[PDB]
Design a protein around this ligand. Structure first.
Ligand SMILES: CCCCCCCCCCCCCC(=O)SCCNC(=O)CCNC(=O)[C@H](O)C(C)(C)COP(=O)(O)OP(=O)(O)OC[C@H]1O[C@@H](n2cnc3c(N)ncnc32)[C@H](O)[C@@H]1OP(=O)(O)O
Lengths: 8, 392
């Protein structure tokens, strides 16, 4: 159940 | 919710403390079930708050599949800053939710009684899972979603208990799942990295930032890719490749500690190419033998509240198996292929051998973590490089 990631 | 272990240490888990999972504090030195299998299972569904009802969703009905599409499009996972939201397509949801062995009662919806509006969902699909030295029939839990207007009313514990009950009825007592939140208790902690393919769009929508020491023109040159892949004999997977792709994957996965065990029918389902869902390219060498393959699935995100750019087209690294082509070359070609297919960004976790190429191929580290979990299974945690399981 995914995690929505963007660039740190 | 807690997204760091620090915040999770101070937290109390009123629901998860009741569940057969290890406590966040303790270290695990055993291998096996937290509790024995139950030999009598509750026959009645758990009670929902008044005005709501259970409804199993027939995803073969295009109208019902569209209702699920809309629930998730409007209410599913967002990033930390509430700027992007997953936008699983209807055809992708069919791929993810009807693999071999899927069951209708495991597509678990919640509707408003009066309006029939779909306001909640959770799903299970069956999977054989290899965890250290044990192979177990399990389910993968995915797509837990509560409508934003129903949040913080403890509907999610009811959804979890109800899917648990429905899986228990079929004789399955362990599950695997991922989450961006910290719960008792991660078996492994992974991190997303991102490879920019369309830097101008990514910077415009604030998915990425322009480095203070770099200009836009330089940033676009930094991320420019060849027009075509370089690996000899790279081509899309075909039906004739299903057995060898199964063979390559099965042998490649033995080196990790948390992996799927796929039948040949499951390999067909998860890898046979479907446009805008799943891409698999094999390497067929000068002798006609398939020696490597790369794969990535299609999962765009809605760009919230933006007047011009509405969607972020993202590719996600799936399973990449190398025996004769270097992994670095394989992943370089995956980037070129994703760029060719119009993707804005290529995402990959730091699991399996991915750390060997992430920095070299100019991936940037993402924010937050992807935690891996087992339900009713006690085992030591593992580093990301030993996780060999990718979920949709
Ligand atoms: C043998 C078979 C077993 C099968 C089952 C195996 C277990 C499967 C487990 C599920 C695998 C899911 C895999 C995926 O799909 S992970 C994707 C989860 N979905 C989203 O993030 C979509 C956007 N958010 C939402 O729809 C809601 O915020 C959700 C539904 C997430 C929570 O709704 P709401 O915000 O209204 O909360 P509440 O007031 O009802 O309830 C709060 C309680 O719920 C605990 N909570 C919060 N988030 C999660 C979470 N993501 N997994 C497990 N538990 C979670 C929370 O800590 C608290 O427990 P405790 O802190 O009090 O203890």
């Amino acid at each position: 159940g995914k995690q929505n990631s963007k660039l740190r | 919710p807690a997204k760091t272990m620090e915040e999770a240490s101070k937290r109390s888990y009123q629901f998860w403390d009741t569940q057969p999972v290890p406590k966040l504090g303790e270290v695990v030195n055993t291998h096996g079930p937290v509790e024995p299998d139950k030999d009598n299972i509750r026959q009645e569904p758990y009670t929902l708050p008044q005005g709501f009802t259970w409804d199993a969703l027939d995803l073969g009905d295009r109208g019902v599949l569209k209702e699920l599409y809309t629930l998730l499009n409007e209410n599913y996972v967002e990033d930390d800053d509430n700027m992007f939201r997953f936008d699983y397509s209807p055809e992708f949801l069919l791929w993810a939710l009807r693999p071999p062995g899927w069951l209708p009662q495991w597509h678990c919806g919640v509707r408003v009684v009066s309006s029939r509006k779909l306001v909640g969902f959770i799903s299970a699909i069956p999977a054989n899972i290899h965890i250290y030295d044990t192979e177990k029939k399990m389910v993968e839990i995915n797509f837990l979603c509560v409508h934003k207007k129903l949040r913080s009313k403890r509907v999610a514990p009811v959804l979890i208990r109800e899917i648990t009950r429905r899986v228990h009825l079929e004789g399955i007592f362990q599950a695997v799942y991922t989450a961006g939140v910290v719960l008792p208790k991660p078996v492994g902690t992974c991190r997303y990295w991102h490879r920019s393919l369309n830097p101008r769009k990514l910077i415009e929508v604030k998915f990425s930032h322009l480095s203070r020491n770099m200009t836009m023109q330089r940033t676009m040159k930094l991320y420019r890719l060849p027009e075509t892949p370089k690996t000899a004999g790279l081509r899309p997977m075909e039906t004739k490749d299903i057995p060898v792709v199964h063979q390559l994957l099965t042998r490649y996965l033995k080196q990790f500690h948390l992996t799927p065990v796929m039948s040949q029918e499951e390999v067909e389902h998860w890898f046979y190419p479907q446009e805008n869902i799943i891409d698999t390219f094999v390497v067929e060498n000068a002798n006609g033998e398939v020696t490597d393959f790369l794969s990535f699935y299609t999962l765009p995100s809605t760009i919230m509240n933006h007047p011009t750019h509405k969607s972020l087209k993202a590719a996600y690294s799936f399973y990449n198996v190398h025996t004769q082509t270097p992994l670095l070359d394989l992943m370089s070609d995956a980037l070129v292929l994703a760029k060719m297919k119009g993707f804005d960004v290529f995402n990959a976790l730091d699991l399996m051998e991915n750390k060997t190429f992430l920095e070299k191929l100019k991936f940037g580290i993402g924010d937050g973590n992807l935690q891996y979990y087992l339900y009713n299974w006690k085992c030591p945690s593992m580093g990301a490089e030993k996780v060999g399981l990718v979920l949709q």
